[PDB]
């Protein structure tokens, strides 16, 4: 928990660096890169310098690699020029030039290092292991050349149905009835358990016996049922119950339910009228016989077959996929890391790690918050010992928002329980000092607020050059942070949407109308500018809500675009029109299939046009005859030139340029044409392509090339983006309507508080449910920290005293169940008055509160 400078850190052993939000995380790593390349840093520096072919740096996303490499090249080039000129401007290069020992030697090393940049080691994890196993694959025993693959979902869908054929068809009717009850198809079976198939298989609490069979489990459940069914009929007939002060005579109804129930065993559910078998109920409504407490012993254990069938399918699906991939010899990202881990698990791990230690005596990892225990095991085993080799980890406990992307947060604390060097940056460079003070104060309410004693938020300071940043509104300035609050004792999600969307649209319209006349200005000191559409954005949670926000925004005639959409282009009507046009040009014989193509909107005709086209045989035959030659041009030329020729011949580019909003319809045609060229060469039959188009119509695959390009990313519009894509993107101003709403998790999945192993529990354990809920609340607070960043001038949000309970006025609100409610109520059942007092207790001149009316 110390400070940090790039020229002071001793580069030995294992070090962990946490640089908070708005630090940059790039201006430091290049400085340390040059520090290792030139071997400076006093006695604390490395014993010997290195070369560019030894400094391995691994990030995760694809686009960051080239950007980091280009910034590195610019930095080393500028450092070389500044070293040859002995006069710099950047203070970092100034202090480095102060620390230079021999300028000629440094310049010679930079000359010999810059020209070797083209092969420097910057990779992703998959690329790193791909380039390491093909280097030393003797211990692994894998093939030299392989064909990669990504559409493993269809393989898993085949495998689960293959299992479901053999483990359901020979089953008898009485066994299969319970199977049919809980779910019907292997499609739903795969949909239920898909989320655990990828990555590392989890340890299952309370495993079934190794040779246990569904018939044996059914027999065991029957043997537990029928004893209490039949031997209790020995005990029926005697009214041993004593009427207490709350003793109800309806006990005979529950006794008669047993007599009605014990005939057959063809069902599976027990009678719900067995509630009063608690022995404590003597003063409520002595046990005097053990059956009245063995009934509750039976009731305490739920009866189901899912606990067996899930594990039995989960082993064999993974086994069958891993064995079926062998006969084709393909490869996958999941399989490659497992192969490398297995090669470590073999006896030759010491030999395999010695070569890696010799080759790369360093490692740097960016965005460490997305790591798996497998990867951390690899890193720990390779670099947990053996001095003269160091390891620098850089990441953030916050912004870890990839829990569904196979990224575990507990491995970070597991690493921090072993490493023992912690440093933190202080500067921000981006936001206003008032905003920094407010975001420090609001998270400085209660200590260890992240529900964890391992993530302590510490204050940070702003920059000395952004202190002149102000946001004014008709003269005087404006508070940086501001809540908005409902009016009413109780409220619902419908009110939460309907009032606040209208209110937010009203305030955005007020800003848009005011700033166009020079009323409100954004100045850094004196240099001001008005507010436009581009400098106004909003942040949301999910997609289904966004229709409300878009409609409320466009009701006041405001251009709204939803940048978060990853929709396939094949969904729109352009694909339908292209299919119709290709079908009609393949078969131009019939009148119906040709007038179907000419009746499309893109040809642009009218009722009189079609009516004249029907009765005029000559003008009909002209259009018939042009397709006769067009089909021959199609056969001779492939796909693309005819899509160019029919584009040019009818001259429909200027039609969609003249018609407003037609550019979105135009761009999708060109994108579809570029999509067709990867199939028009590998396939030749004209039947195959028109079959292929209708084949992909029914399946919107989520490939990155299938999404829609931006129609106008060039001018001033209003942006609506989600939290997950908001990482790293700066905005001037932003709103936040839906920060109060939340959804409770109910699926049993939790990590151990000591071993940190992702253990999955089949049976419903309330302790595990509570641990999972605590982890989910920590994730939501991390989301809140992500959301309350990247606002250089001002951002604002609303809040409601929403209750999830059915009866409203009980005095027990459910705000503290959410993330922001814990920040104000600190785990207290409250109401509007108490929440109001908590809001205005800390309301002083930076935070300003306000009431919100439905206007």
Swiss-Prot record:
The N-terminal DNA-binding domain (residues 1-929) is a ssDNA-dependent ATPase and has ATP-dependent 3'-5' helicase function; both are stimulated in the presence of RecC, suggesting this domain interacts with RecC. Holoenzyme reconstituted with this RecB N-terminal fragment has no nuclease activity. The C-terminal domain (residues 928-1180) has weak ssDNA endonuclease activity as an isolated fragment. RecD probably interacts with this domain. The C-terminal domain interacts with RecA, facilitating its loading onto ssDNA. Interaction is decreased by ATP. The keyword Cell cycle does not apply. GO terms for biological process: clearance of foreign intracellular DNA; DNA recombination; double-strand break repair via homologous recombination; recombinational repair; response to radiation. The keyword Magnesium applies. Changing residue 785 to H: Large decrease in recombination, loss of Chi hotspot activity, decreased RecB helicase rate, retains nuclease activity but not Chi-sequence specificity, does not load RecA. Changing residue 25 to Q: Subunit loses ATPase and 3'-5' helicase activity, holoenzyme has 3-5 fold less helicase activity, 20-fold less processivity. Its EC number is 3.1.11.5, 5.6.2.4. The gene is recB. Residues 248-250, 493-494, 542-543, 743 bind DNA. Heterotrimer of RecB, RecC and RecD. All subunits contribute to DNA-binding. The C-terminus interacts with RecA. Interacts with YgbT (Cas1). (Microbial infection) Lambda virus GamS protein interacts with the enzyme without displacing any of the subunits. GO terms for molecular function: 3'-5' DNA helicase activity; ATP binding; ATP hydrolysis activity; ATP-dependent activity, acting on DNA; DNA binding; DNA endonuclease activity; DNA helicase activity; DNA translocase activity. This is RecBCD enzyme subunit RecB.
